[PDB]
Design a binder for this molecule. Sequence first.
Ligand SMILES: *CC(=O)Nc1ccc(NC(=O)C*)cc1
Ligand SMILES: [N]
Lengths: 14, 175
Amino acid sequence: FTDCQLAAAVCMTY
Amino acid sequence: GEEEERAFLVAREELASALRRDSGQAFSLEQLRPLLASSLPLAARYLQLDAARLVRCNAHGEPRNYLNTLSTALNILEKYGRNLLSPQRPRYWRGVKFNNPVFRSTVDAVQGGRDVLRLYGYTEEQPDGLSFPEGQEEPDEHQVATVTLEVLLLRTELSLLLQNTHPRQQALEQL
Ligand SMILES: *CC(=O)Nc1ccc(NC(=O)C*)cc1
Ligand SMILES: [N]
């Protein structure tokens, strides 16, 4: 994945 | 013996304080040299993370592959700790749900990835994931900063092993 897919996904699990 | 350990713990506390000062700070390989070029064993250098278990229990297949799956999990786990130290935390930071494709492919793809979230403060086992206890209203900055630094340091150590430029590569390769 890209670094922005990871950050956006982090906010998705909240 | 205890002097090399003392110098490590002092440098660990110094770098963890800078994380609290700025949660988006990027550390150079020079700033991490006191933490990278250390002869101390893993148990003396990783006080919160279980580096040996996270690496050996996930060492299955080729090192090119599982060291990378570990790095991606450590990368996304670092962002979890950095958001907790941010001056403007995310809205629902208190809980983390697991039914996400990226989460399944990163954190839930390595053994012990969920347990790193416990070190941040997500100790309440919920149906869909983990959450902070009902008592705490804000995360412990010192605990989050030290765990985020250890997650950052381990990802750095694994990245140098993949580049074959680790200062103690031969010792770490023998897990
Ligand atoms: C490229 C990049 O930095 N992207 C990015 C996307 C999302 C977020 N944050 C959230 O979704 C909360 C940060 C960075
Ligand atoms: N969430």
